[PDB]
Amino acid sequence: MLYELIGLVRITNSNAPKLEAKELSSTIGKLIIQNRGVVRDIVPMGIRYLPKIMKKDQEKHFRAYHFLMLFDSSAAVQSEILRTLKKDPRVIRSSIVKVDLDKQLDRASSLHRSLGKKSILELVNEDYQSI
Amino acid sequence: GHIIGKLVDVTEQPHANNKGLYKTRPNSSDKRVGVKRLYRPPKLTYVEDRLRS
Amino acid sequence: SLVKLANTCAHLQNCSKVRVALTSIPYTKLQLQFAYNLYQQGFLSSLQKGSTMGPDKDFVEVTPDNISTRRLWVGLKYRDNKPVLSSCKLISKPNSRIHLPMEDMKKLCSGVTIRNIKPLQPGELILVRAHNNIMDINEAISKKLDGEVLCRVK
Amino acid sequence: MSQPLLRNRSPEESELLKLKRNYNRSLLNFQAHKKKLNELLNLYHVANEFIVT
Amino acid sequence: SGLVGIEDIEKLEDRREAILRILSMRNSENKNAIKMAVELARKEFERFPGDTG
Amino acid sequence: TLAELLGRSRIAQVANNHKPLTYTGKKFHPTHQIIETKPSTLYRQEWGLKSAIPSKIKSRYLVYNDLDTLERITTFEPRGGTQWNRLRFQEMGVPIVSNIGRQNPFFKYISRPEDESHAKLSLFKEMKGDTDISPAAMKKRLKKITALIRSFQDEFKEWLVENHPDELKLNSNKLEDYVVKFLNKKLETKTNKKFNTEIIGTGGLSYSLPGKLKNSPNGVIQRTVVPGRILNVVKENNDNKWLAAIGGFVADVVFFQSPPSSFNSMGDFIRMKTFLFEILEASMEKNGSVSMHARLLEPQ
Amino acid sequence: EKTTLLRDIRTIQDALSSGSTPKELLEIKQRYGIQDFSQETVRQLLQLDISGLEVNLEKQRSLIDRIQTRLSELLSNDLKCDQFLKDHGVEDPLTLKKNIKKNLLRKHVMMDMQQPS
Known part of the structure; x- marks a missing residue:
């Protein structure tokens, strides 16, 4: 099944804002590819201010690094990833939504589909045939 | 001059359709009684109306 | 099917109430014989084979390919602001079939209530089925036939 | 009234009918099979962007 | 019509590994497994090709 | 027959129109057919x-949408005022000219493919001119077309290897050119938007040909003077020209050098006074509007 | 067998384009049975069943279309129809009914496009 993970990582060090996000993406990506999974895309979303002050593991946060990760795995692996994210102190909020593949095998991230790009081939073919 | 009340039988559609399939049995629309069409005042149409617009 | 015949009798009553000149009924041997008797007795103006969409103008052979789309088209008659075919009811019902000997059919046509069947009235048509043929009760009495009393039309 | 109510299909008509119906089922299976392969080809073109190592 | 060389075999093997992980029955919904079972069962009981009823 | 007569009846001649009878947006041209009744018939509400x-x-004069409605009334507005806008334009005797110097649309000119060198610009305009098309009916232009174009594959798999084999073995820069031409050549026979609904030229506002001089008892008229009204007391924001109301049209007025002092004095009531203007030129835009340029002739 | 189709097909296309004949090819000539290594042997190792189905479907469509056109034309011309029946061995086809004879025509048109093929 194709899944879309959206994680809000903590920005502890203002000098290295994209450090825990990179370390986290590597940890999650390794779980996926080491359990028969495929990582289709990693779309960084940048530092954004949280809609409110949020709390996690007796800590408070006002900003986070947003990132999206489109990956293919089994249901059991998907639950294992979600369990690890809900326990990691770095992660403030994490959501995994299924992307239906009944009609087509290649679906882009919701962010891209919102912009009209329905498949990763459309994104790649707009970076080769026109770039 | 369109004919009202005529059903095209499957024997009259021997060739394949636009999808490439032959018609071998009546479809659901062919099996619904269409008596109402005989009594509804026909919509009068004219080619000239398209040019006028 | 007596159920189909019940459906047709009710259908003709509904069409008469609204005064539609032309309507369709299912295409079966029993329905065709029923309609033909009504036509010969002057209850129906016309009887044509056709399709779900209307009566056929030119002969269309009926086969398994189009049997499901066949219909019988009948013309209803109205005179002096009254329907000619006002009522149409079954006598022999699906859950209670009535078979009468020719002797009892003669009593029914003579004013005697037989097996709760009200006797034949002036200007009424009672149809009887014998060996899968439908005929007027008076004709069955002439041929000495015993049969199922199907319906009464007025 | 004298016309027969139904005329059974001749053995030849049933043969041609079976040919068309077999063709209809086979064409749909083939078209679905080719659609699946065309989706497998478009997935091969993008599998260079997918990570398994 | 020719006269970027060719891709390393290791890269083509990774494209195959990504396609087989995405299409693995062990990574798909249980309904897909049931759909395969229905096809297998149908073919063991059918009277002829296309018999589904 | 009655059907034949009906199709030619005067009511049939009026094209179906359901456009709002009360429209508060920008009006550039008439939207409804004016209906006129004679005085004798008006006396009898006919x-x-x-x-x-x-x-x-x-x-x-009236304009209508529906002959009858569920409310048991006619949907009509008792106005016919777009005719006076056209007749006032005729009185100003300013021919409509093309600011792009295009051929006159009312003459059957012998045109050539000078602009047809943009075959890939307009052949794809059919699928790319979908600014306001449904999200799925526009998507039906992708599969429906793909099958039609995919049916010419064999024809183009032989013509291209028989007329330009070198390109198929060297480069596709010219192959793409042969493709755009192929479809158009095989589409000119087809009928895709064979009827064009775009406004043709002036749209009927003026059938006057440029060139003619206006003779007058006081000699040939060299400059057309038309009374008008200034709407704003401050030039259009971001534009170096004010706006005037001349003969049922809103024009852009250019002043000689300075703005008359009645502007500051009158203020927002400047529209209450009538000035004399000179109509420099009149152009037609693709929206179906008239671009009238004027000049505030001031007593001197 | 660690050997993969892609790799094996990349050796039969490099050995066939370079001239090298490592013993792997002989083994590959046994893994697949392809004794001869030519450009028209890799094309027969990678054949997909779908290709065969596509040609069987065209033949099926041809037969149906031909049978219908043949009978359609025959019926349009009563003279060519009467001759058609006599040529195929019908005795006095002229003296036959529409259904009693159209079935013969159908049985013959389907005996001239399915028996000869």
């Missing part, structure tokens, strides 16, 4: 419509 128009109506 307009040639389905029902009598209410006697309260004293105008002889």
Whole structure:
């Protein structure tokens, strides 16, 4: 099944804002590819201010690094990833939504589909045939 | 001059359709009684109306 | 099917109430014989084979390919602001079939209530089925036939 | 009234009918099979962007 | 019509590994497994090709 | 037959129109056909419509949408004022000219493929001119077309290897050119938007040909003077020209050097006074509007 | 067998384009049975069943279309129809009914496009 993970990582060090996000993406990506999974895309979303002050593991946060990760795995692996994210102190909020593949095998991230790009081939073919 | 009340039988559609399939049995629309069409005042149409617009 | 015949009798009553000149009924041997008797007795103006969409103008052979789309088209008659075919009811019902000997059919046509069947009235048509043929009760009495009393039309 | 109510299909008509119906089922299976392969080809073109190592 | 060389075999093997992980029955919904079972069962009981009823 | 007669009836001649009778947006041209009744028929509420128009109506001009409605009324507005805008334009005797110097649309000119060198610009305009098309009917232009174009694959798999084999073995820069031409050559026979609904030229506002001089008892007229009204007391924001109301049209007025002092004095009531203007040129835009340029002739 | 189709097909296309004949090819000539290594042997190792189905479907469509056109034309011309029946061995086809004879025509048109093929 194709899944879309959206994680809000903590920005502890203002000098290295994209450090825990990179370390986290590597940890999650390794779980996926080491359990028969495929990582289709990693779309960084940048530092954004949280809609409110949020709390996690007796800590408070006002900003986070947003990132999206489109990956293919089994249901059991998907639950294992979600369990690890809900326990990691770095992660403030994490959501995994299924992307239906009944009609087509290649679906882009919701962010891209919102912009009209329905498949990763459309994104790649707009970076080769026109770039 | 369109004919009202005529059903095209499957024997009259021997060739394949636009999808490439032959018609071998009546479809659901062919099996619904269409008596109402005989009594509804026909919509009068004219080619000239398209040019006028 | 007596159920189909019940459906047709009710259908003709509904069409008469609204005064539609032309309507369709299912295409079966029993329905065709029923309609033909009504036509010969002057209850129906016309009887044509056709399709779900209307009566056929030119002969269309009926086969398994189009049997499901066949219909019988009948013309209803109205005179002096009254329907000619006002009522149409079954006598022999699906859950209670009535078979009468020719002797009892003669009593029914003579004013005697037989097996709760009200006797034949002036200007009424009672149809009887014998060996899968439908005929007027008076004709069955002439041929000495015993049969199922199907319906009464007025 | 004298016309027969139904005329059974001749053995030849049933043969041609079976040919068309077999063709209809086979064409749909083939078209679905080719659609699946065309989706497998478009997935091969993008599998260079997918990570398994 | 020719006269970027060719891709390393290791890269083509990774494209195959990504396609087989995405299409693995062990990574798909249980309904897909049931759909395969229905096809297998149908073919063991059918009277002829296309018999589904 | 009655059907033949009906198709040619005067009511049939009026094209179906359901555009709002009360429109508050920007009006650039007439939207409804003006209906006129003679004085004798007006006295009897006869307009040639389905029902009598209410006697309260004293105008002889109206515009309508529906002959009858579920509310048992006619949907009409008792106005015919777009005709006076056209006749006032005719009185100003300013021919409409093309700011792009295009051929006159009312003459059957012998045109050539000078602009047809943009075959890939307009052949794809059919699928790319979908600014306001449904999200799925526009998507039906992708599979429906793909099958039609995919049916010419064999024809183009032989013509290209028989007329330009070198390109197929060297480069596709020219192959793409042969493709755009192929479809158009195989589409000119087809009928895709064979009827074009775009406004043709002036749209009927003026059928006057440029070139003619206006003779007058006081000699040939060299400059057309038309009374008008200044709407704003401050030039259009971001534009170096004010706006005037001349003959039912809003024009852009250019002043000689300075703005007359009546502007500051009058202020927001400047529209209450009439000035004399000179109409420099009149152009037609693709929206169907008229671009009238004027000049505030001031007594000197 | 660690050997993969892609790799094996990349050796039969490099050995066939370079001239090298490592013993792997002989083994590959046994893994697949392809004794001869030519450009028209890799094309027969990678054949997909779908290709065969596509040609069987065209033949099926041809037969149906031909049978219908043949009978359609025959019926349009009563003279060519009467001759058609006599040529195929019908005795006095002229003296036959529409259904009693159209079935013969159908049985013959389907005996001239399915028996000869």
